[model samples]
Structure formats: structure tokens, C-alpha cells
Target: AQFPNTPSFTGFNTPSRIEADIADLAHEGTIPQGLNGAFYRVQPDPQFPPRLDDDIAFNGDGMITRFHIHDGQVDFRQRWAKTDKWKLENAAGKALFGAYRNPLTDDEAVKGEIRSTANTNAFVFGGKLWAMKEDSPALVMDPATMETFGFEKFGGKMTGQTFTAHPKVDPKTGNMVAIGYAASGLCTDDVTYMEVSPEGELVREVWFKVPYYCMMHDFGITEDYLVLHIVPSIGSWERLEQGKPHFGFDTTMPVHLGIIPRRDGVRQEDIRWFTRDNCFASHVLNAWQEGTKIHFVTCEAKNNMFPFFPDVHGAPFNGMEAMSHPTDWVVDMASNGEDFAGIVKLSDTAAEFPRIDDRFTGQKTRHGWFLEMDMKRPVELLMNCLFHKDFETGREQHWWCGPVSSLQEPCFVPRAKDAPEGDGWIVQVCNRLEEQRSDLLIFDALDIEKGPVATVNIPIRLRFGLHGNWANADEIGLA
Candidate 1:
């Protein structure tokens, strides 16, 4: 809490240095018979104070947490990802890094070290847990113990200095479709599209140049096409040379939507670019192809989502003014060969961090969940509830945890492989601010309006988490 003036010093963004393994957590209700898995979440927590005396919340180190539920009991474990940068700072006994992604501000002792924190997201794929950040390679870890092993570069095929936090896992093909912005250099138009097999093999890597250097946090993928939503948040080498923030939102630029065919020998010219009004999208809910059309869901904001980042005029934005709603973007191939021509506002409710049944990824699904926020409240505070959307029926359900309580990202856990979509449980870490305590809330996905079916009380508060996945006992080698 050294930097009290920054948003990272308050609320859920507060740093926690505790790393421990605990078993047999206290519970309030009956645990579902089908709930036999581990919920792993990643959060940004700095190990030492920042060298610059102040830093953005996203610059913190990665902390992986696991909640194992089996035989009607729960266990908890957590550990730092132990990236190269973290280890370097640990040996130095203080903060060696400065800004977020700006390596020029680092100390001379570790001049060329990787500055990636790997704190964005965590998932289990190919029988291994991968902690990921947008600016660096994936850090592999032991899912059972949250022990960081090392970096994963697809057996040396991943040549970029960074990989995106969001990668689309194709259910039909058992492959992952991923992309990296600024793949070649800092603030460059270079982007790399990659496809990795289910066996953790990098099969295809395609290099393409974007119209500009933008913050491409997430992308959408269909069965035969790769969708890129190039929004307005942009960066440049000049900004870094001038010692300015790495990114800013340019209102003059148009949002570019690029569609590339997912096939070998496909050149950059094969990708179609369409232009639309400018906006920003940090994450995508789901996407799929129907005939010649493609559809996806994203939270669209009028300006930069992170107020800490300077705007085009080098002025910081008001975080509360950058509210977004769950908006739908649809592209028709039969149209006039322009960018996504259709835009629909799905809900008036302000939301972000959308999640769906990952089993239906790269395809169509009915249920989509998001974190609902009250714009009138302080932007630094946590979200109020978990909002669920029934796309087909146009129905919505939400679970609100009292006025003082805040909830983090909700992870969907399937009851069974063959069970109906959305017929499972939603597990999320809930923080009761007034009590200064945290708990695990499990809700029946289909009936979330009824509130939590069970609750597990935790002795300490877990700062707001970014993203995670549910790995069953078999996947974690617990069986």
C-alpha cells in the first residue's frame, strides 16, 4: 500500500503477500454430488513495492489460486507463478520493474529481463495448467500444487515476445486459435496468428500486419474464419520514447474488423478488413458461424476502458465515464463487403468479463454470463452481481450479494460432459467488504436467481481475480 494515490492501492486491488496451502474449508450448505473439481484463478499481486512509487494494477505479478472440491469437502492452495521477472526482483529484495510493459524503466541490473507478470488468466489444457499474460509466453504450472515449472513456447515455435491472454479453444477441432499483437517489436503493426493442437503442439503460425498498433486484448474465432476486433486503444514507439504511457485511446480512428480464413497458405491479402465507428472491447463472450454470417458478443465502451491510460491528448480519462454494455456485433458476408455492418445492443445493463460454457466455444451457445456494475459507484470498487443471459429466450437472471459485498469473475463448471448446456454450477469468490472476509459462492447455473446453493467461508480475502477455469479431479491427476 505504498502508492496510496493510485487505484491499485485500494479495494480488491490491494496486494496480498500470503501464499499457503489449507485444507477442509468450512462450508454452509450441502455440496453438489457432481461438484468434484478444482477452480483455479489468477490475480495480479505485486510481490514488492513498485520502484516508481506508483504503478497500475495490471503491472502486478501473477498469483495462481486453486480451490479443490472432492468427496463433499474443499481444499485451497496458492503460489506465485515465479516468472523470470518475479525471480529477478525476489533476489534483489525490492522492485526492479517500473511501468506496465515499458521495459525502458527497469533498473540496469536486469536490463533485458522479461517484464511479463503472467497475471491475466489461467486454464488447463493438454493436461497442463498455463498461466498467461498478454506481453509474454505462457508459464506452465503444476495444477495440483500451483507450482510454477517454466515458460511454454509451443516447443520453440512461438517466436513472438508476447502472447494474448485470450485464446479460443476449438471444441470441434481440439485445437486452440491464438494471436499476439506487437509480435515483432514494441508498438509495431506485426501480429501473429497461431494454432495449437490439443496435444500442445504448435501446428500453424501465420504472420500478418495490422493497420496500426492497437491493444488487441482478445479476438473471436469461428469454424473456418479468424475474427479480429481492432479497437481504438493504440500505442506507438514515439510515446515510449517521450516517456509517456504505452497506450491511449484515439477517437479519430475507426474500429477495424478483420476476417481471415483459417487455412494453410492463406496470405495477409486473404484477410478482409471492415471499418466502423470507434469503440473498445477487452473480452469476447462467444462467436460462431451460421451460413455466411458471423456473430459474437463484446462489451463496448465509448472510450478507453482503463482510465489510468492516457487519452490521445495525453490526458487521463474518468474511469466511471468509460462504462460499457453487453453489445452484439454481427457480420454478413452477403453485405457490401464492408466491416461488420450490424450492431445490436443486447442489454442496457453495464457489464464486463463475460463467460459462457466453454464447451460450446467456437460455436453457438444459449447462456452468457457477465459481471454487472453500477456506474454511479466508484470504479475502483468491485462489481455487484453475476448477470446471466439466456440469448434464445431473451431472459436474464442475476445473483446479487448484498449491498456491501462484491464478487469477482464467475467460472462455469459443467455438471457432466453430456449434460445440457448451462445445466451446471457457477463458482466465484465473493468478498464481503464490511466484514473484511471472503467466501466461495456456488450457484446452480440454470437457477442463479435463487442465489447460492452453497457457500464456503475463507479466513482471508482474495483480491479480485481476472480469469480462471475449472479442472476436474481427473485432469489435475487427483484421481
Candidate 2:
């Protein structure tokens, strides 16, 4: 697709405090005054590719895509309450899957509007897709046109806000539900349920609270219950810098998974809360039944690696710049729903310390390997995560670009079971850090560490992207 050339329509509203990071870590207060909306895509690549330049890269063969949101005003289409609602400060982000075309640039100057349901993340249900807007009651948009074709405003009294977590759409009820990581601290907002309608109408909302505060990366929700990855507090910008209390609260906190229900009042009296050492964020992918074994990928857990380090200075190196890898573990809801039974430690190439930021997960390999990669590091590294199938024997693998490659959104397209262990394809985009070019690589879905099948060098360099989806040939429909 070509870059949008529509005219840029300036809105009359005064610029508001669009940056929502009270701590200012993600955006770092650099986003534009009116920045809103975003785009993402994850596609399969048969011919696993390579980096564009004489630089190292994370390995893969996939057509990966990502874009930023640039709406000029508060225009997320869906809303939850009819009255004063707890609206997201702005569209923090969005999940996108559509035509593969270049977008509008300042030079091209386009006015084509991108559709979204505000701050909520999106997900696919049945054959269709849906999303709830920030403070939204209900919202559904066509992935193809991004048109808010259907919408419903839930009338009630509550404070509601949302963070983008491409929601987990319930197959049974066709209703899509995600968890609200946070709610309006203000009095008017009271609802913390990340609830939405399936056919574009308000259904039910649930409430959950984490001990410490952090964003909910992604959640696995079923008709019966919800699993929230409670990331411990890293303190706020004010608390960290000036030694002030975190909004007058303590900083040291424990990280645990807050398991709750999907409705307002339903309760499971015997549910055992899962606990783990503190980590930054997590993504849960359920394989089957309500409490069946689920894949959990928690990132950036360095502070807990050493157990009883002398002091903060004694803490192990966990940042992206460091060589340590993140902890990749699993939760078997059947045998051990709350306990992490298996662990694959992707340790630092230099030492025994584990690295962080393997945030993406695709599918399980014959070895029962879950594929993913790290984004925190590698302006140009092909970082991928490999999870083994055998839970009895914990096994995991990690591959990273040498020094000059970068990757985004690692996902897998499952081939026939008999194809090969890594027979399926692992798809992701790569950027050559040294040369400033990019490539879409296709890795043998299995054995991603081996090499690429084919490479499609992108015509241009794109910004960092969070996630993407595949448009298979059958799904693309000869496009």
C-alpha cells in the first residue's frame, strides 16, 4: 500500500497532556503533543531471510510490520459509560492487521483517518475481530477497513480506563474480554474490568487488583476466571529519582499473578493464587481448557536472580545492554495451575545470569518449544525464544543477533505436525543497525537458530513495533 496522501486536518482543540506514562519510562515524554493510534502486523515467511547490511541480526524469515498512531485529537470511537467516564488520557496504542501498504508521512501529508476503539487492545474472535475503546462500553472495528462498523455505549456509573492488550476473545460467548490494568484513581471511575461486547453491546465487567502497580502486558481470560500478571512495583519516576515515596506509598513489593473471575461477583473460593519472583511484565497464552497448561513469558527479572544480593549495587545486570537473558517459564493449570512447573533459562552469553525481554510467543515446536524473541536489546539483533514441548524436562533456547541486527514480533505458523520439529515458519522483521536498512525474514518455524529460508529486504526502515499478525495466503484471499 502507498503512503496516505490525504490532507492533514488540524483540530481546534488545545493540546492536552497526551503522554500517559506517569513514570515516563516507555515514551520518555518524547511523543508528539497530539500523538494517538498505532498499527502492527505479523505475517509468515517461507523463505527465511537475512539482515540487509554487513551487520548481525536476529534470524528469521517473515514479513513483519509496525506503525505508530498519529491522530490529532481525542477520537477513540468506543465508550463504556454514558456519563462522565474514566477516559484514557489518550490512545496509548492499538493492534492492527490490514492492507500491507506504506502510510502517510509529513511530506505526503494525508488525511485518511485510521479507525480504533481508543486505548483498548484488539483480538480476533470466531472469524471476525473486535476491540473496546478507552473508557469504552463496547466497540467493534473491521480489521480490513478499520471502520467502527458497530458500537455500543454501556450506560452505568463507574471509572474505567484501558491499556492496549489485544484482548482475549471468548469463543463460547463471542464476547471479547481483556483486563483493565488500571482504573481511574479519581472517585468517578470504579470499574477495573476489561470488558467488551461480542456483537457490539455491553455485556459484563469484572474487577481485579494487583498488590504492586505495573501495566498488564497481556492476559488469558476464560468464562470462569482471569489470570493477571501482577508485575511488582519499580517505583514511579518521582519515587525513583527524588527518593520520594511512590505516590506516598512504599516501593518494595512482591510480584504475583492475580487470578480472578470474568464477571462482577462470581467467586472461586478454592482458587490458589500463583506466586513468583518479581518480573516486569508477562504474556499468557492458554493452550486448551479453562485451567489447562498455559504458556507464561515474564520479562526483565534480574533483581531476583541473585536471591540475596548485598544491595541495589550488587544487583545483577538485567538491562537490555547487559548480556543476561530473561526467564521463560510455563504454568500448567491442570497439574500445577499456580506453580511454574517448567523453566528455560536463556542465560547471558557471558555468564550464568538470565536475560530479559523475550516478550513475544508464537506456537509450540515438536520439542514443545515456544518461539519468541527479545526486543529490549538489539537495535539490530535477531533475538528469538524457543520453548521445548517436554514439561517434565525443562528445556528452552535463545538466539540473538550478533551486533548489528534488530527484530520485531516473532510468531509461528504451524505446518502439518509431520512436517518437521521446526518445520513451521517463524516470522519477524529485521533491521540492520549499522546500515539503517531492514528485512523481513522467514525462519524455519522450527530450528530458528539454524538459519533463514528466504529473506525479503524491506524497501524502507520502520520504527519499532510491538506485535503483528499473519495474513496467510488463504486468509489474504489472493491479495
Candidate 3:
């Protein structure tokens, strides 16, 4: 209810943290009997008002929402991740934190405390729900009740102060490979690569240095290597001291990719770095290995997609200033290893948040999906439709929500483990502007052009979310 004057505090971004249950949500079509899982989404929903002049959407506290679907019955619940910042603010009853990550801006009472809000994304692995904040250890949650279980340090093996929000889970080996940028400090070139076993055991930790301190928001993973993209969106201790956003885009710096081998006998120095013209990839769709080649795909932008982070000149970045297109970066291990053989433009649409079936992760897959926007539209930031790319057929399918509606990221749910590559369903949350309500849409993965096979209507509009996943009945705890 507070901070209503800030842009992020309006519309679906309004800060409302409430938990409720809706039994057998009202729907338009029949709920698939095979749909037996809990859909969990994580979004930044700040509780107290921001301490600064203007609040950023990314600085909000984290909130997790769960939609439980089983035997044609659906229930919903929402809870905020009880991070240190959240607890401190609630106890003090005011905004005690300032700036995204600059400790210099925090109140004296909370100085030197963990500022992570555990808000970026949510996923289930090792039979536990992990709400990650990239800047701090992942806060564990009870999968069924959405109860916070405190931060996880991989049994004390996670040595770094930060963990990446995006970790690639290898479908074949059941291993989770992740990288932490800014591993050492605010603007250090150090990064940490970690591998956790299927049983949630921390098996390996490798530290490497990047060319520069950049935001490694996401990374790519092949069966044999961990792919790192070093974009120009960087941080500097000097800039933070100047009272600026911790990160900014530097067009003068070249974007680089570091491919680290996952096999044994590979040391940190063995990580190969390749150069590319300055570009930004906030999220990677997927990457796969083929003999000596690795293929990486994502929505690439010429500049930083986050408008809140200014350019090198400290000029505010407007969304319209950035141009995004789906791209493919092909890395040839047999080549000279200085740069990508070629960076091919895959699609000429403005898109972000690319996703693929987890089962095909780290393996070449025929299908990928993204939320797309119109380049001609001058809106701030919102995806208007869903785009499905069929790499096998070299064709694309789409389903658009009317101009007034906006869609969030969609999670692919397989009908069964052994089902066809793209034979399951695409689950997404869509907000209807006119009704001020939201709905869960389910589309047959193979034919997304036909639109939703079912829709679960929610009476309240949920804040625009960052990422989410589908956990099967066995993976979730029943209420």
C-alpha cells in the first residue's frame, strides 16, 4: 500500500502480500487429468516503502506463489521469503534498507547484514524448494507449505557469498551446475563455478577470474562444459561510491564467453575465453554440446535490457533504446578458440525469458519458447504474447493475449518423463488489465498456436513475476 508514487508500486507491481486458498479454481475448459503438480512463481514484492527517492522493481522483497493442481482440483497459496532484510524491515516497521546492494546506503542498525531478498526465481531440486537471490545463499522452503527453512549453503561447501539465480540442472546426470559472478566482491573479476549432485551434495567448486566484473545473470550448460557469458553490464566499487546504481552498461568493453570443462583434470586456468562484439543476454534459452561444438541460444540485446542500470556515461537507459533479437552463438572447440565461429540471428522479434523443457536441458532440443513484444510499441516493459519456436521444423507458432493483457514466463511441464520431446504442456500466468485479475493458462506444448486448453482464473492480480517451475505431485507437499 505504501510507495504508491513509484512506478514499480503501481498496477500489478503493487506491494500486497497475502496468503489464501481457492479450491477448484473457476475454469473455462477441462483441467487435464495428467496435470498433477505444483506451479511455483517467485516475484519481488517489497513489504515496506523504499528508503530512496524512486524504488526499483528489482529491489523489492521476494514473494513466492504456489498453485497446487492434482486430480482436476487446484489450490493457491502465497508467502514472502523470510530473508534477513524482510525480517528486519518487518520488525522495525519501516524502510531500513536503501539502494539495491550498496552497503553504504543501509541503515546503521542493519549494516554488514545480508541484503539478499531471495527474490529472483524458484525451483525444486533434491526434494527441496529453493528460492534464490543470486547475491546470497538460496533460502530453502518447505515445498508443500511454502514455509521458509533458512538459507542453504550446500552443507557448508558453498563457500561463496553469492549463488547464481539461474543454475543449469543436467537432465542426464541429475547434477546442478551454477556460477556466481561477483564472487569475491562488488566489482571483482572473480567467479565461482559449483556442481551439486542429484542428492543435493556439493561435489565441486571451482574459482575463476573473468575479464571484467559483469553481471552473469544466467549461464549456459552443455553435457561436457559450463558456458559463461560476460556482457558489458558491469559493476564498479567506484561507481557505487559515487552514489550510482551498482551496475552500468559499458559499450566499450567486449563481451566474452568462458567455456569451462566439467570433466576431471580441468583446472581453473583451463577455462577458455572467447570474445564477441558488445552485447547483452540477460537470460539464456538453452545450450547443448555436439561432439566438439556447443550451441547457445537466447534473446540478445545491443544494450542493457534493465533500464534502471545506466550506461557508462551515467545516462538513464530507456527501454526503447535497447533492441533485442533471438540469437544463436556457435562455439567450435576445434577452432582457434578466440571467438565464436559465428553469431547468427535466429529470430527478428523482441523477446525475453526464453525457456525449454528441463528434461532436454544440456541436450539439443527441437523446441524453445519465449514471451515476445512488439518493437513498434513504446511501452515501458511487458510481454504481449507467447512465441514457440520449433527448431526441428524451422518454423514458429504464437498465441497473443490481447493488447491490454500481459504474460509472464511460462514453465514447460512434460506429460511424463518418457513423453515425446515437446509433448507436454506450457503453463503460464497472464494478467488481464481490464478485469484486474490473473489467470493460469495451459497450452498443449505441441500446438501453442491453438491457445490454452484450460485456464484457472485468480480473483486477484499477482505482481509480474521473474521465474517459476512445475513440481510434480511427488515433488510437492500436499496441504
Candidate 4:
């Protein structure tokens, strides 16, 4: 029962399998009086050593953590999402699963078992928590009590085998906009566009195929369109058969952005594919329609951003090309051409895990925040600082977490129902790697330079996580 000595399984990335509750966490500075909601995030922690002796960190099991901030105090709770694979392994008391998204290498006993660790996101919507991994059905959990409630099918309406870890809630419609690629089976070109009502009902679903078979991890949405970026994180059963990682960055393949109308009876022919030269981009900052122009904001890199998913051509990882800068890729809906109309560089800083005032999901946003990956400092695959970029004013702010610390994705929480855009608190987790502890930092959204308004002291060391979201107490049935 030993873990590998790999970078992902060592230091702050080590697994912590504890499931416990702390009444009120100790903190420094003054906690915001009005900050009343829950910040939910997750870690991919393997319950046991990899059955294959070694595997990627992304293959770990889902551990969801909730910070309930209320009455100027924060309470911490952590629990496993308890997916089918989780229960099966718990009974066996060992790792039965194999590589990430590669079921071919698994043990014979659990051959057809659903392989989702549900580790990518702890998403809160429709009064429930959706623990999602892009590979399988989203496992739903009770938001208030941190209890697993099994996978969601919307009363047996959802038929897709996979679901997007990233779902956008249309501010105007108050519905969750989602897509499930590989909807039919593994490594297939099939995809399904879905919309779920505020009350957790599957309202509409449209099936289609992408330009190629790839890992469509995140997508963007506009007022009337679903924005899907097809990068070269492509995969196949052949690759799985070869014992390679599920996804690989193909520099030869051109990137495509498919814009589909969000409406009834939308067909594959109705979606337009806008192509560009190959580059790496994930975790969309946003996409919005300006008249006939569609601007998709992303941290655009020039080569393989994920070293783990090495280049399919067997080339080396290009650190220079991996530095993703903020860029706006503009495409015109009125044009018949397949190329982008214009590409605008928004910032010179290299960063990832972009977030915005999600209330303006399908609309134009003034400011955006993200974890800054400063390469100048000692690189640890962990972010060294947090950034706030003003897309309108061309101004920016930075808050460094120091040399020994790295930060996770930041979630924006508005001060009030009527608060202006970007007028909120930014809550994120910081890893004190040297100290072997974690701190939940809350900052003035617009003035991140002023630093954390409050820092909640987490007693345990939480591993590096992917994405998180802030949900109002009432929105999650916790009020």
C-alpha cells in the first residue's frame, strides 16, 4: 500500500482521506459580515495506491470540501463523493481501477464498472452539489449535510455516459447549460448539448458530433449560442490500447470553435466550425456575442500546456509555448469563412484557471480573475499568485502568495443581489507547502492587491484541486 514518488503524489499533492467536520475554523483579519454562502471545491485523492503501481494525479478519487461561511465565521466539512467505483473499491479495500479514463488496464472483476472518480469539480446548482468528472455521470450529493445521493439522471432523462465538469448557468434564463461529449461511448465523436431547468429537470438535449474525438473539458455559452472549443487533447481506443494516456496534445491538428444555436431542434449542420492553427487552451474565461461577432476569451498557449498528456508526435514539452497568455479569439457569425475574424491579446501575463463574475456568464464582463503561473519563481505546477485583469480599463492587480505557497481556482461571490459586476469577495484555497497546511483566503474582488480580508486556518493539508464555485445559501437549500 505505497504511493509513487512522483511529483503529483508527493509533497502537498499527497492524498488526505479524512472525512471530518470542524465547527468554526480559526482565522486572521476580519471575516466579511455579509459573506454568507458555501465555497465548494474538490481534490482528486486516490483512496488506495494505484493498482497499476503508478498513475496520473487526475485519476484520483473525488474528495469534496465545503467551507460554510456564515455570521462572520467559517465551518469546514470534507467528504468523499462515493461514486460506484468508490463503493466497489471500499469493499475490496484496495485499488481495482487502473489508469485515468483507460479501462483496458483495469482488473477483470470490475471490467465494465463506471470509471469516473468524480474528482474534477464540486459544482453547486439546483439546490444540490454535482461532483463531476468529465468521464462519467455526475454524482449528486446533499449540499447541506455533505452526503452522497448517487448519480443524477433527472428522473431518468439524462442518457449520456459522460458529463462536462464545467456547466454554465445562463443568467437570463437561470438554467444550467451543459454538454456531454462521448455521449454514446468511449472515444466516439458524438456529443450532446443539454439544458437543465432551475428545478433540476432535464429540459432539452440535442445530439451531435464534433470535428474530432478529443477531451472537451470546458465550453462557453452566450445568450443564444453554445461555445465549444475543440483543442487537440484528442484520444482514441487505439491510444488506450497502446497504454498511453487517454488524451494527447496533437500539434498537427487545427483548433476548432463550434458555435451552435441554443434552441429547439438544433442540428449538427446548423453548427458552424471556425478553425485556427493548433494551440493549447482550456478553462474558458468566457464567450459573448457582439452583434455578428463572437469573442471567446481564453488563456491561449502555443503548445502542449499539459506535460502529462505529452505531444502525440513524441516531441518534448515546450515551456515557452506552454505559457498561455490571455487572448480574445473573435469569429463572425455572419461570415461564411471558417477562420477567426480577429485575435486580440488581452494581457501579457501567463496564467490559467480563469474565472469571472459568473452572473454575467453569457454577457460582457468588465473584470476577470485567475491564478497566475509565474514561471520566474520556482515552478511547481502550482500557481504562485492571483491576478485581476480589467478588460475595459487595461489595468491589472496581483497578489502573491509567497515563495512557499501556491493557490487554487478563485470563486467570486457577489456582495448582494444588486451588487455591480466584480463587486464581490474572491474566495480561494492556498497551499502552504513548506508549512504542510492550507489556508482559505478571502479578498476584496476588485482590490486583490490589498490582500486577503480574511484567512481561514485549515488544520489539514488539502491536495491541489481543479475548480470550485460559490453558491448562495438559499441557492443550495442550506438557508
lDDT per residue, candidate 3, 129-216, as tens digits?
8899888888888888778888888777777778888988988788888887777766678888888887888888888888888788
Candidate 4 weakest ten by summed lDDT:
374-383
Candidate 2 lDDT, 374-403, residue by residue in tens:
544544323443332323344444456446
TM-score of 2: 0.53
For model 3, the stretches where C-alpha displacement exceeds 4 angstroms are 314-321, 375-381
Give the top-scoring candidate (lDDT): 4
Candidate 4 Cα misplacement greater than 4 A, ranges: 377-381
Spell out the clash pairs found in candidate 3: none
Worst 10 residues of 3 by lDDT: 374-383
TM-score of model 1 vs. true structure: 0.95
Error of 2 at 11 (Å): 31
Q: Give stretches of model 1 more than 4 Å off.
A: 1-7, 314-321, 375-382
Arranged by lDDT with the best first, the candidates are 4, 3, 1, 2
Give the per-residue lDDT of model 1 (tens digit) for 1-479. 35455667766567786798889899999778788989989888889888875788788899888889888888888889999888998898888888887878889888767778989998887778888988777788887767788888877878886787888888888887888888877788989888888888988888999888889999888888888988878877777778777888887789888888888878988988887887778789888888878886788887788776668876667676578888878888667867675888898878898999998987888999888886455433248888999989999897778777888899999999898889899999998887788898889998899989889998877886888889888888776
My TM-score estimates for the predictions, one after another, are 0.95, 0.53, 0.96, 0.98
* Model 4 TM-score, 2 decimals: 0.98
